[PDB]
Copies of this chain bind each other. A is one copy, B any other.
Amino acid sequence: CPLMVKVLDAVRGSPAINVAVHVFRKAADDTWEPFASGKTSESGELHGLTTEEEFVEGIYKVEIDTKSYWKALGISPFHEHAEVVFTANDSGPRRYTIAALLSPYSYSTTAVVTNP
């Protein structure tokens, strides 16, 4: 899987389930074009967003709808969303895992990049 997203909840010590994720790619005209979307599973993971053929060099944005997640739990959170912007595949195809660890007033994110 060339792009996978994993989301964890630091308040409950659980995967963050049913979180909406939207991925965009920067187009020739410098606008964000929709690329893929989905929701995290019971394991906090979102697989199957793209394929190796479609996931070309470019600048991508992964936007995680953290606000809806916290509001459904009864918490008014600080951020509107958590997003990650990165260049992908500029030295050839790679596999990317984007992980995010969420709290109401904080988030942490890391990337794991592997060469298949």
- A residues sitting closer than 8 Å to B (CB atoms) are 8-15, 59, 75, 78-81, 83-87, 99, 101, 103-114
Q: Which of the residues B12, B80, B106 comes within 8 Å of A109, measured between beta carbons?
A: B106
A44 to chain B, nearest CB (A): 8
Complex Cα distance A92/B20, Å? 30
Interface of A is mostly: strand
A15 shortest CB reach to chain B, Å: 7
Q: How far is the CA of A114 from the CA of B9 in the complex (A)?
A: 12
Could you tell me if A79 and B84 are in contact, using CB atoms closer than 8 angstroms? yes
A84 cross-chain contacts in B, Cβ below 8 A: 79
Residues of B contacting A10 in the complex (Cβ-Cβ under 8 angstroms):
10, 103-106, 110
